[PDB]
């Protein structure tokens, strides 16, 4: 049960906030869980999805597919993967949008900031 007086349980307000979230907030909203091996290694549960991350889909028609992320369309709330595509009536190939919550991260693109965020996340869990 919510107790903080500065947070609202209003459905209208929650939906408005989610759908008007700016890009920085959308990055956090577009988080995905880590695979079992990465979870065990880093003591972290979920991470924001990055462009160069390796991702395995776990829901939908592409449940078995995996590949590198190639675009994070925050405006559309989706990500695009290397070979997860489809053919149009024209015959040309187009990537299929996948929601990050429906995928699993198998390999992270690590930099100084990514390592610092991983350490911060692991510290609280202990």
């Amino acid at each position: 049960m919510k107790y903080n007086p500065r947070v609202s349980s209003s459905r209208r307000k929650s939906r408005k906030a989610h759908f008007t979230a700016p890009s920085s907030v959308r990055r956090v909203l577009m988080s995905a869980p880590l695979s079992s091996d990465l979870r065990t290694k880093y003591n972290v549960r979920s991470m924001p999805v990055r462009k160069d991350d390796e991702v395995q889909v776990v829901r939908g028609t592409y449940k078995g597919r995996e590949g590198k992320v190639v675009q994070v369309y925050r405006k559309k709330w989706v990500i695009h993967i290397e070979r997860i595509t489809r053919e149009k009536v024209n015959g040309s190939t187009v990537n299929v949008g996948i929601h990050p919550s429906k995928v699993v991260v198998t390999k992270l693109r690590l930099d100084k900031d990514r390592k610092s965020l991983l350490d911060r996340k692991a510290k609280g869990r202990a």
């Binding site: 049960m1 349980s9 209003s10 459905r11």
Partner: protein
């Protein structure tokens, strides 16, 4: 309740005037001007599109009620008495087939429980867990417009745990379990003792609260300590067993 009412100016933000008779149209006031779809249309009427409703709702409606304290206490005592009848508790929809005895009085050690898992184990031990499980399983989305009015989920009512120690941790331990409600013996609420106005709430008493009941509600002979000058009401019938009276020796002779 929270008051509701339409805007007092709604349907009156126009300078509309009646055309009068002689134009082969109704006498309802009509918007002035021209060059727009609104011009010439009716206004100010409860039967007019975009008009003012009949008898607009107002905030100074009598929302609240002032019931005598004695009647409130009568209702609370009646609900408490009904909670001790297994037939009424079953009739109210509670699964009490596995309860050892009613009223259900448990050891005061339950008041020190801190974890929801331990609270669940205590419920299983005392036999009140089937009712909580039924309440959890009944979780569903509210039908109708209420689901979009910030009342999305409805469910059945589980046990009500009455404790007698201020600041006990069992409130925290139990508050997350669906259907389970908690209350202090000194501030019992009729809304929880008789949900929906129906008697026979399933209640789990701590020993301290059960002991304090006598000092709170007194008795027929002596007065209450916590309620100044209050005495429990008496029924019009001393013995409600009608068969015993009707088939007694005196009447049948």
């Amino acid at each position: 309740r929270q008051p509701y009412a339409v805007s007092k100016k709604a349907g009156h933000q126009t300078s509309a005037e009646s055309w009068g008779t002689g134009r082969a149209v109704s006498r309802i006031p009509r918007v002035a001007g021209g060059g727009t779809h609104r011009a010439g249309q009716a206004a100010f009427g409860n039967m007019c599109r975009g008009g003012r409703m009949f008898a607009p709702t107002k905030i100074w409606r009598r929302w609240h009620r002032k019931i005598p304290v004695n009647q409130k206490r009568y209702a609370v005592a009646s609900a408490i008495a009904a909670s001790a009848v297994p037939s009424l508790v079953l009739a109210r929809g509670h699964r009490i087939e596995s309860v050892p005895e009613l009223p259900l009085v448990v050891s005061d050690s339950v008041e020190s429980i801190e974890k929801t898992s331990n609270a669940i184990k205590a419920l299983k031990q005392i036999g009140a867990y089937p009712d909580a499980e039924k309440a959890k399983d009944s979780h569903a989305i509210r039908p109708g417009k209420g689901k979009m009015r910030n009342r999305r989920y409805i469910s059945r009512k589980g046990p009500l745990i009455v404790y007698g120690t201020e600041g006990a941790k069992l409130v925290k331990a139990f508050r997350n379990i669906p259907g389970v409600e908690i209350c202090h013996v000194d501030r019992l609420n009729l809304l929880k003792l008789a949900p929906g106005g129906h008697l026979g709430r399933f209640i789990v008493w701590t020993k301290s609260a059960y002991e304090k009941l006598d000092g709170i509600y007194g008795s027929f002979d002596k007065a209450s300590e916590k309620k100044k000058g209050y005495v429990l009401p008496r029924p019009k019938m001393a013995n409600a067993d009608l068969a015993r009276i009707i088939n007694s020796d005196e009447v049948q002779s």
